[PDB]
């Protein structure tokens, strides 16, 4: 739902940090992979 969007949009900041980029990238991979059923209902996001 909205927690998915909030978490993705907030981790997008750490994803491009030379430190702790891998933690954010792992969480982002997991979220995009698991919330596939939702992301197909919100293509505009």
Q: Give the whole-angstrom CA distance, residue 20 versus residue 35.
A: 23
Q: Which residues of 13-44 are buried (b: 16+ CB within 10 A; e: fewer)?
A: ebeeeeeeeeebeeebeebeeebeeebeeeee
Q: Any idea which residue has 């919330």 for tokens?
A: 35
**Quick one: resolution in A?**
2.8
Which two structure tokens, joined as six digits, stand for 42?
């919100």
5, 43 contact by CB (below 8 A): no
């Amino acid at each position: 739902g909205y927690p998915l969007e909030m978490l993705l949009h907030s981790l997008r900041v750490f994803v491009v940090d030379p430190e702790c980029a891998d933690d954010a990238l792992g969480i982002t991979q997991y979220l995009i992979k698991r919330g596939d059923e939702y992301l197909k209902r919100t293509p505009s996001f």
